[PDB]
Design a binder for this molecule. Structure first.
Ligand SMILES: [Ca+2]
Length: 92
């Protein structure tokens, strides 16, 4: 088991996993698009990648906010949430 996986298993909260990763990473790279991501590469060629947008604040009375929630969900969760999202939009 490589370093990135051990960090992800032992430090489930992003802030703690970040401390572990930054202590030993040989590279740190940013992905700017989408949620934004920070990539920590380790000596064993594993990589821990952390999302920069892991929360969403939805105003249920605002169509754009609801649509933004839907877009921010991954595809599988969006399918699970689709009928609720439709209910929300119809109520606006
Ligand atoms: Ca995500």
């Amino acid at each position: 088991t490589k370093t990135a996986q051990m960090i992800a298993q032992q430090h489930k909260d992003t802030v703690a996993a970040c401390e572990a990763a930054e202590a030993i990473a040989i590279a740190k790279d940013q992905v700017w698009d989408g949620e934004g991501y920070t990539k920590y590469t380790f000596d064993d060629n594993s990589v821990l990648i952390q999302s920069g947008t892991t929360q969403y604040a939805m105003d249920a009375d605002d169509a754009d906010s609801i649509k933004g929630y839907a877009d921010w969900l991954d595809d599988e969760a969006r399918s699970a949430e689709a009928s609720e999202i439709e209910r929300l939009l119809e109520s606006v």
